[PDB]
Design a protein around this ligand. Structure first.
Ligand SMILES: Nc1ncnc2c1ncn2[C@@H]1O[C@H](COP(=O)(O)OP(=O)(O)OP(=O)(O)O)[C@@H](O)[C@H]1O
Ligand SMILES: [Mg+2]
Ligand SMILES: [Mg+2]
Ligand SMILES: [Mg+2]
Ligand SMILES: [Mg+2]
Ligand SMILES: [Mg+2]
Ligand SMILES: [Mg+2]
Ligand SMILES: [Mg+2]
Ligand SMILES: [Mg+2]
Ligand SMILES: [Mg+2]
Ligand SMILES: [Mg+2]
Ligand SMILES: [Mg+2]
Ligand SMILES: [Mg+2]
Ligand SMILES: [Mg+2]
Ligand code: NA
Ligand code: NA
Lengths: 136, 177, 307, 50, 85
RNA sequence: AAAAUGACA
RNA sequence: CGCGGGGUUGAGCAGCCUGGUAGCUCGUCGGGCUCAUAACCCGAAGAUCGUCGGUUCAAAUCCGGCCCCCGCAACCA
RNA sequence: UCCUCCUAAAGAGUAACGGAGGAGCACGAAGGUUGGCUAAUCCUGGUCGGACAUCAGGAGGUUAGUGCAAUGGCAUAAGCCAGCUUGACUGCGAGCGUGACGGCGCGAGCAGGUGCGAAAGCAGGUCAUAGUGAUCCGGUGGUUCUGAAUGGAAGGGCCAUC
RNA sequence: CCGACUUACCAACCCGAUGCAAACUGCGAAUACCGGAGAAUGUUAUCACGGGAGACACACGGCGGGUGCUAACGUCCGUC
C-alpha cells in the first residue's frame, strides 16, 4: 500500500505546494513517466497505476516507484461541528510538482513502454507524459 | 630481576640478528602484564569477591583494584557500580619477577598440558591466556579454596604485528605448540 | 568492655540510678537478664520511692508491676484500667470496631466512584456537593493503615549438612578466674534443635564462639560439620554498621535477593517485612530496636543455611 | 514534599537564626555549620533547632 | 432527529510565557557599564574583552565603550567584546 | 461420624 | 463516532492503586483407596499478562496507537 | 497556575476546544574551591562467560553523559573522581532587561568577616530555563522605638520567621 | 552439540545512485529591525508633565499561515 512504517509525529500541517521538482531525470531505468501538473498523489493511485503497469508487460523488466507518500491526511467524520481537536489520520499522499518522474521502467521495448505508461496515467489525477533517458 | 638481566643483551641479539634490526629499539619489548578475573557470580555473596580479591593479591604481591559494571545489562542482572571483578596491572621488576615464576613453576602445573596455543593474538602482537584453575600456583593452599576461580592474563607488548610477537615470547622459551 | 550481655545491661541500669532520680524511665529493662535477676529486680522497683515509666515486652513482668497501662498506637496514646489481661481484651475491641468502621468508609467511597463515571442523562448537572465530598473522601484516604501488617517471613533451606554438625570431647576452656566449660563431651547431629540456657555470664555466648572457632579452646579439640551454611545472630547485633543504609545492610549492599525458588526478587523483600519502600535509604542507626532486630533476622533468612 | 523546614539558632547567645530544609528520614544527624552572626559580627557555630 | 453529534477533546493545548531572549544591543552601539548586551539560554555568544557572563549566561558589559561582535577561536565560536571609549 | 452408583443378553 | 470498564496457564478471579513480587478455587496429568466409576488422599505440569511501540536500570501495572468485547449517553426545540 | 518545542512569517511579541511532553521536587552534598581524567559504539584476543558482564589493543571522536521533560549549550569541560571545606555569608549596589501595575530578573564594584589555592584568583547555592500563593488575621524569637496623669506593664511598630 | 547446507526471504551496518520533513541543518537570501553620520524636506511631525475623553462586538481585499475538504460572505493569528 506504500504507507510509512514508524514515523516520528502522527499528524502534520497542511503546508503548501509551490515550486518545481527535484527528481527531474531518469536515472535507474530506461523509460520514465514524467509529471506536468501539480497535485497530491495518494497511496491508492500509486498502487492502481502499478497494477496497470505490471499486468501490461505481464512479467518482464523492473518497475521503479520513485515517490513515497510519507504525509498523513486527516479527515473529520460525518456531521461533526468544527473544533474540538484535529481529524484522525485517514490516508497518505505524496506531493507532486511539475517535472517529477513518478514511475520508470527498464527492459521493455519503447513501443510496449508507451502503451503500458498510457494505461497507468489513466489512474492518476495529474497530466503526465512519457520521457526517455538521455546521456546527459 | 632474574629474567631482565637476560633480556637486555641476549634476547636483543637473538632478534637483532634475526629480524634484521639496526636499532636496539626496533626490536619489541614487553611492557606490562595485566591480570584479572571477572568473578561475575558475586551477586549472591560479597565474600565471593572479598576472598577472591585475596587470590590475585596472593599471586601478585599487589592489592587488586576492584572493577565495576560500565553499563547496566538486564540479562546478567547487573547495574552500574557493582564490584564484579578484581584487576592487577604489573610493571617493572614485579612484571619480570612474576613473568619468571609463571613460565617456570606455574605453567608446568597445568592439568592436561599439550603446549601453549599460538593463534590467540590480536593483530598487533599481544598475547592473551587463561588457566581455568588457580590452584596451579604455589600460593594457593587447597584449604583456603571454595571455588574453581580462573584467570585471564594478557601480556601486552610493543610489537608492531603478531608474527614477531611469537619471536619475543619464543626467545623466552614459551611453550608454543 | 569484657562483661556479658546480661552484665552490660546491669551496668546501664546502675548508671541511670546513681543520680537517684525521682523519675525512672526504663526502656526495655529485662532483655539479657536471667530469672534470678528478673526475680530480684521485681522487688527493687516495687520498693523504689519515686515514679517508674517502663516499656517491657515481657507479658509476665508487666502483670506483676503495672499500675496503669498506656497504648501509643498510631500517634495517639490512650490509657486503660485493670490488670494486664484487661488491656488485651479492651484493645482488641478497639481494633475490631476500628476495623468495622474502616470497611464502612471504603463502602461509601466504593459506590461514590461508580457514580462519578456514570452517565449524566438528559439535562442534569451531577451535584458538586457530592463531587467535592468525593474529592474530600479520596483526599482522606491518605490516612493511617490500622493493621501494621503482620510481617511475613520465610527461611531459605539449603542442602542437608553432614550427619555430625559439632563434635567436641575433652574440651575444657576456662577464663582466668572461673571455669566456663570444664571437660565437655557432646555431639550435635543433623536436625537436632538445642537450647542453651543457664545463668548470666556462664559462657553461652562464648560456647558458640568455640563452635565457630572465634576463640581457641584451651584443650580437647573441636571438629566442625562438613557442608554447613551457618546463619549467625549475635547477642549484640554487630553485623550491621549503624550508618549504612537499610537497603545495603540487607543483602550486603547488593540488589537481587533470593526468595524461595530462584533469584527473581529485589527490594521486594522489604515489603514482606513491612518496610515502606520509600524509607530504604535510612541509616540503620535511625531504626528502632525491634526494627533493627528484624533487619538482621531478615538477611539471615535471606541466604541458604543448614545451621 | 518530604523535606521539613528547620532553623539554626546561634550558639553565640545573640538571638539569631538561619532557616533551611532537611530530609529528616535520611539525615538523623543534626547540622552544625559555621556561618555569619551579624549581631556579634563574627563567624560562630550554628546548631539545629525547631 | 439526530441533529447534534458528540465531540471529542484535545489532550494537549498548553504553553508557557515567552522569555524575550535575544540581543539587546547590536554591534556599533555605545553602551554604558554593567548593562545587558545579549540574553542567552546556553552560550551561543561567549564573553570576550570587557564583558562578563551571569549565572543565566547573560552577557553584560563591564566598562563603557562600543559593542564588538567577533568570531575568533579554533572552533569558530562567536564572542562579544567592548572597546575603550 | 462419613458409606453415592453399576445398560440389555 | 462521544464516555467508562475489561482482555491475566483449559474455566472463573486477585495482582494494575502509584514499577521490581504472577497467585487462589475448579479443571488436566501421574500414583493411591474400590470388584469398578464417582467422592477422598498424595504429588506434578501448564501463562511472552489482546497486539505494536514509548519512558525507565527494571512494565501485567505508567503513557500512546490499533483489535475484540461489555455497559452507559445521545437532551432543549 | 508554571516550564520546553513547533505554529511564529531569519530582532521582541503574537491566536484557536491547533500539534507534542512535562512541574507542584531533590541535594549538608548532588554546593565552594584546588588538583587530575575523558565517552557511545563496533572489530580482534581471552576460563567458565553467553547477542549483551570483567579484561587487553584497534577504529571512531561525543552518535555518550548531565538528579527529573524539551530546547540551547558544554572539553578551558557545565561530565567522572579525590582532598580541604560552609560564600546555600551580613549591609549595600552604578547600570540594565522585562512587565499596565503588583512584581520578576542579571549585575561589575564598596565595606565587615570566611573557605580553598603557592599565588594570579574564584566563591552572595546547583549547566540555564518549572518545582509555586497577594493582603488581612494570628503564633514564635530579638530590639526601651512608643507607652492616653507619672513610673511600669499591656497593646502596637521595626527586624528574622511560621 | 556441530549446522554439516540449499535460498522464493524478516533485515542490521557499509558502499554507489535517487527522493521527503513545522516540531531535521555540516548551507542560506530578499525584506524588516537596532545604532551612528550626512543633505534636502515636513506650519514639532518627537518626548515629559498636567486637564478631558472615548474605545476594549470589528468587516472585507492583497500577501504569509494554523484549522476545515488548500469548502464557506466559515474560523483564528501577522502585516498593509
Ligand atoms: N572479651 C572478654 N574479655 C574478658 N572476659 C570476657 C570477655 N567476654 C566475656 N567474658 C567473660 O566470660 C564469661 C562468659 O561471658 P559470655 O559472653 O559468654 O556470657 P553468657 O554466658 O553468654 O551470658 P549472658 O546471658 O549474661 O550474656 C563472663 O564471666 C564474662 O565476663
Ligand atoms: Mg448417574
Ligand atoms: Mg521571532
Ligand atoms: Mg519576523
Ligand atoms: Mg551538580
Ligand atoms: Mg579542573
Ligand atoms: Mg560542580
Ligand atoms: Mg538542572
Ligand atoms: Mg502611662
Ligand atoms: Mg512586640
Ligand atoms: Mg471585553
Ligand atoms: Mg474582542
Ligand atoms: Mg480580528
Ligand atoms: Mg468573517
Ligand atoms: Na552472652
Ligand atoms: Na525502640
Amino acid at each position: 500500500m506504500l504507507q510509512p512504517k514508524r514515523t516520528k509525529f502522527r499528524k502534520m500541517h497542511k503546508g503548501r505546494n509551490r515550486g518545481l521538482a527535484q527528481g527531474t531525470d531518469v536515472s535507474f531505468g530506461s523509460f520514465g513517466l514524467k509529471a506536468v501538473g501539480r497535485g497530491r498523489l495518494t497511496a491508492r493511485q500509486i498502487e492502481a497505476a502499478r497494477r496497470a503497469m505490471t499486468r501490461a508487460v505481464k512479467r518482464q523488466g523492473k518497475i521503479w516507484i520513485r515517490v513515497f507518500p510519507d504525509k498523513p491526511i486527516t479527515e473529520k467524520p460525518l456531521a461533526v461541528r468544527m473544533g474540538k481537536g484535529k481529524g484522525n489520520v485517514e490516508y497518505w499522499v505524496a506531493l507532486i510538482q511539475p517535472g517529477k518522474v513518478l514511475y520508470e521502467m527498464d527492459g521493455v521495448p519503447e513501443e510496449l513502454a508507451r502503451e503500458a505508461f498510457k494505461l497507468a496515467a489513466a489512474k492518476l489525477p495529474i497530466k503526465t507524459t512519457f520521457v526517455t533517458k538521455t546521456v546527459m | 630481576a632474574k629474567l631482565h638481566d637476560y633480556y637486555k643483551d641476549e634476547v636483543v641479539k637473538k632478534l637483532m640478528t634475526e629480524f634484521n634490526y639496526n636499532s636496539v629499539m626496533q626490536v619489541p619489548r614487553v611492557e606490562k602484564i595485566t591480570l584479572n578475573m571477572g568473578v561475575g557470580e558475586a551477586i549472591a555473596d560479597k565474600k565471593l569477591l572479598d576472598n577472591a580479591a585475596a587470590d590475585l593479591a596472593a599471586i601478585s604481591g599487589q592489592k587488586p583494584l576492584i572493577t565495576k559494571a560500565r553499563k547496566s545489562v538486564a540479562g546478567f542482572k547487573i547495574r552500574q557500580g557493582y564490584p564484579i571483578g578484581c584487576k592487577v596491572t604489573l610493571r617493572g621488576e614485579r612484571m619480570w619477577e612474576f613473568f619468571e615464576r609463571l613460565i617456570t613453576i606455574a605453567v608446568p602445573r597445568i592439568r592436561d598440558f599439550r603446549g601453549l596455543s599460538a593463534k590467540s593474538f590480536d593483530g598487533r602482537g599481544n598475547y592473551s591466556m587463561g588457566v581455568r584453575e588457580q590452584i596451579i600456583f604455589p600460593e594457593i593452599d587447597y584449604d583456603k579454596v571454595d571455588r574453581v576461580r580462573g584467570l585471564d592474563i594478557t601480556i601486552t607488548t610493543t610489537a608492531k604485528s603478531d608474527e614477531e610477537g611469537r619471536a619475543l615470547l619464543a626467545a623466552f622459551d614459551f611453550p608454543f605448540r | 568492655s569484657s562483661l556479658s550481655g546480661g552484665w552490660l545491661r546491669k551496668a546501664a541500669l546502675g548508671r541511670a540510678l546513681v543520680s537517684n532520680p525521682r523519675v525512672l524511665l526504663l526502656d526495655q529493662p529485662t532483655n539479657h537478664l536471667d530469672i534470678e535477676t528478673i526475680d530480684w529486680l521485681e522487688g527493687f522497683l516495687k520498693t523504689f520511692n519515686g515514679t517508674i515509666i517502663f516499656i517491657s515486652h515481657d507479658r509476665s513482668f508487666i502483670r506483676n508491676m503495672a499500675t496503669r497501662i498506656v497504648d501509643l498506637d498510631r500517634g495517639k496514646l490512650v490509657t486503660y484500667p485493670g490488670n494486664y489481661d484487661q488491656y488485651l481484651l479492651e484493645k482488641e475491641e478497639a481494633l475490631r470496631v476500628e476495623e468495622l468502621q474502616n470497611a464502612e468508609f471504603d463502602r461509601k467511597l466504593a459506590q461514590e466512584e461508580v457514580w462519578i463515571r456514570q452517565g449524566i442523562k438528559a439535562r442534569r448537572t451531577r451535584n458538586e456537593g457530592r463531587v467535592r465530598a468525593l474529592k474530600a473522601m479520596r483526599r482522606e484516604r491518605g490516612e493511617r493503615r490500622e493493621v501494621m501488617g503482620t510481617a511475613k517471613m520465610q527461611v531459605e533451606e539449603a542442602s542437608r549438612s553432614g550427619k555430625i554438625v559439632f563434635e567436641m570431647e575433652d574440651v575444657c576452656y576456662q577464663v582466668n578466674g572461673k571455669q566456663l566449660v570444664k571437660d565437655f563431651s557432646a555431639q550435635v547431629l543433623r536436625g537436632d534443635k538445642i537450647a542453651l540456657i543457664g545463668p548470666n555470664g556462664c559462657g553461652k555466648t562464648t560456647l558458640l564462639k568455640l563452635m565457630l572457632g572465634q576463640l581457641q579452646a584451651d584443650s580437647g579439640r573441636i571438629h566442625v560439620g562438613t557442608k554447613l551454611e551457618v546463619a549467625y545472630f549475635d547477642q549484640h547485633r554487630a553485623e550491621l554498621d549503624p550508618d549504612k543504609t537499610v537497603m545495603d545492610n540487607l543483602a550486603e549492599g547488593k540488589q537481587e535477593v533470593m526468595v524461595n525458588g530462584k533469584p527473581r526478587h529485589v527490594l521486594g523483600y522489604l515489603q514482606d517485612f513491612l518496610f515502606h519502600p520509600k524509607r530504604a535509604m535510612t541509616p540503620v542507626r535511625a531504626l528502632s530496636g525491634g526494627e533493627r532486630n528484624r533487619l538482621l533476622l531478615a538477611r539471615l533468612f535471606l541466604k541458604p543455611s543448614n545451621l | 514534599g518530604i523535606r521539613e523546614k528547620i532553623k539554626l539558632v546561634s550558639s553565640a547567645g545573640t538571638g539569631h537564626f538561619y532557616t533551611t530544609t532537611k530530609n529528616k528520614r535520611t539525615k538523623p544527624e543534626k547540622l552544625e555549620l559555621k556561618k555569619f552572626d551579624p549581631v556579634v559580627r563574627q563567624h560562630v557555630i550554628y546548631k539545629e533547632a525547631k | 432527529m439526530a441533529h447534534k453529534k458528540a465531540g471529542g477533546s484535545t489532550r494537549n493545548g498548553r504553553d508557557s510565557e515567552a522569555k524575550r531572549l535575544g540581543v539587546k544591543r547590536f554591534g556599533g552601539e555605545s553602551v554604558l557599564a554593567g548593562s545587558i548586551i545579549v540574553r542567552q539560554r546556553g552560550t551561543k555568544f561567549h564573553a570576550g574583552a570587557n564583558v562578563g557572563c551571569g549565572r543565566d549566561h547573560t552577557l553584560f558589559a563591564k566598562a563603557d565603550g562600543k559593542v564588538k561582535f567577533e568570531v575568533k577561536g579554533p572552533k569558530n565560536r562567536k564572542f562579544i567584546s567592548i572597546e575603550a571609549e
